Ligand binder design. Structure first.
Ligand SMILES: COCn1cc(C[N@@H+](CC[C@H](N)C(=O)O)CC[C@H]2O[C@@H](n3cnc4c(N)ncnc43)[C@H](O)[C@@H]2O)c(N)nc1=O
Ligand SMILES: COCn1cc(C[N@@H+](CC[C@H](N)C(=O)O)CC[C@H]2O[C@@H](n3cnc4c(N)ncnc43)[C@H](O)[C@@H]2O)c(N)nc1=O
Lengths: 319, 319
């Protein structure tokens, strides 16, 4: 429970990006009304009030809504920030709003399926031409040679050199266990793990017509790239950024090339490592989907072709 | 599954202590027979063969026994290390053995209740006067001021100074969530978290008559100590060491004052922090017990008295 809220507030990239993304829109928020969808402990609703909003409706479905209300009171804002429990789909606000703010992104952007609630609130409560913060999201994929995974798998074949016992057979076992499943793995990588230039495979203008239907059918696209050097290819990492409109937009990124965040990246491991070399061509397609039992659980459909190998498919679901 | 075996082999304290604890007993093992209870991937059975044992029976109940057999084969030892699947309580060995080795310790020493299987194998299969490795275990307790916990709880009251929003109310919420439960928390501490001299509260000679019954009734004892300085007392940490007989015995320790191991320590948090000062007297009693539904789940009964406060009790069970 509180672990996730701890990780959020200790996430300076997330917190400062929202703080400044909101403050950057002071001109659009001053004297206006805001709806914070999934307000959690309330910090984004306070940010909006501090950016000058005249009234903020902080809607939160989880039990932690009570803490938001106390946060509001401690900051002297009970007169203009109103905390409302329950789902935004049935909350009753006294008025439509000039802006929506929300921290709706999950692991792999869409795990938890929360973007649909923001879109429902936009259709229901946002005035015509109103503001959404963030306004867009972009999805990226890169092939990876996960250095930590390479070490963990390879260490079994190093036991002879550290303890005098050959355990190299455990490398294959570990490979089957760690790579031969179909779960999305959430882990943080660094630039050292990125094996080719990251590719943007989709862009979501959050206000765009039809996005609700696109989320049900699958969001994604094709990609192509060329490997930087000789390495074991372990699979692909997927991450996102979101953009707050401005006049140079502020981007909150979850790329392994950028400061770590609590979203980490979503890793899609092949069943076993594939050796590649400099300039090995990799192409494929990535689709993010709801799981059929539960649209809130992220599913990722991967098609990929490595060099001259045949195209393969692997269908992943969130761990 | 494989995560735990990875953490074991990457644990140089654990692995090197067993390696040298076994090699230290070359005189007792050479040309003799060994039973490795819960042999897992087999490294301890190989160590014994390398210490000169003529035959080693590696008994492993989990599915990973097949990897032990392949490890044995890769090291050319299939003629004298025999991997036997299933529980040691019903394995059939062709002979009684001169020694038992086992890595039976769990979190908080006794979580998983495996020591009972080693004791069953001792009674059933160990020759009279035979060797047990390790031969003894000692249990320690210290009051702690968990610096990481102090930071995590206190950070909510620091949000005003980092983001301009008072969130100090979340400190109390977080305290209730992180401390006001009755779960044993497994976490690694360091010497900076230790608030008084650690106290040995029990010693287990593993070969001693009656230990099986003592494990069912509870293992533990009283302790008393005096605080080093002014700090918030968060509770107590429990850890262990085991000793391999020799001629100066080798000790494998899980103390926070010693190099980290995969056992970490077992933390027993009070419902809320208690301020203490230099020389505040703390006394109490710690009992490790089986959980009533499931003797394999560790239960810890804590009685404690801090300074002039009344004695309190808190009954914990493994997370
Ligand atoms: C890996 O990051 C994912 N992640 C994120 C959060 C953070 N949470 C608070 C953010 C808030 N800016 C803050 O400052 O606390 C966002 C989701 C929150 O929105 C709530 N929510 C969802 N659907 C709703 C609906 N239809 N109507 C109303 N509220 C709805 C949900 O209850 C949760 O509290 C979480 N808590 N867990 C997670 O795993
Ligand atoms: C926090 O550390 C706890 N920890 C430890 C282990 C390590 N494991 C292998 C150690 C082995 N030296 C090696 O080198 O792999 C020990 C327990 C192993 O003993 C097996 N076992 C238990 N009761 C048995 C019975 N009555 N007869 C036969 N085998 C029995 C059990 O199947 C397990 O494999 C684990 N695997 N998980 C855990 O959490």
């Amino acid at each position: 429970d509180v672990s996730v809220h701890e990780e959020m507030i200790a996430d300076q990239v997330r917190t400062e990006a929202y703080r400044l993304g909101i403050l950057k829109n002071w001109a659009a928020l001053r004297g206006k009304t805001v709806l914070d969808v999934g307000a959690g402990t309330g910090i984004l609703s306070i940010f909006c009030a501090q950016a000058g909003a005249r009234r903020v409706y902080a809607v939160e479905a989880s039990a932690i809504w009570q803490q938001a209300r106390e946060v509001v009171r401690l900051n002297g804002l009970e007169d203009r920030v109103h905390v409302l429990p329950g789902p935004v789909e049935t909350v009753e606000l006294p008025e439509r709003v000039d802006a929506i703010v929300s921290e709706w992104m999950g692991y792999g952007l869409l795990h938890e399926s929360m973007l649909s609630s923001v879109l429902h609130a936009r259709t229901k409560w946002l005035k015509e031409g109103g503001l959404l913060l963030p306004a867009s999201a972009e999805l990226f994929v890169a092939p990876i040679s996960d250095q930590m995974l390479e070490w963990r798998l390879g260490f079994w074949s190093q036991v002879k050199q550290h303890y005098g016992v050959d355990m190299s057979c455990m490398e294959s076992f570990a490979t089957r266990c760690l790579m031969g499943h179909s779960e999305i793995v959430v882990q943080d990588l660094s630039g050292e793990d990125v094996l080719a230039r990251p590719q943007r495979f989709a862009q979501l203008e959050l206000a765009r017509a039809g996005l609700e239907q696109e989320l049900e059918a699958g969001v994604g696209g094709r990609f192509r790239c060329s490997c930087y050097g000789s390495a074991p290819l372990h699979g692909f990492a997927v991450w996102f950024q979101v953009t707050f409109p401005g006049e140079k937009p502020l981007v909150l990124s979850t790329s392994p090339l950028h400061p770590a965040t609590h979203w980490k990246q979503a890793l899609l491991y092949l069943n076993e490592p594939v050796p590649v070399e400099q300039d090995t061509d990799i192409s494929g397609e990535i689709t993010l989907l709801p799981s059929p039992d539960n649209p809130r659980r992220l599913r990722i459909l991967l098609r990929y072709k490595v060099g001259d190998h045949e195209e393969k498919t692997k269908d992943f679901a969130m761990e």
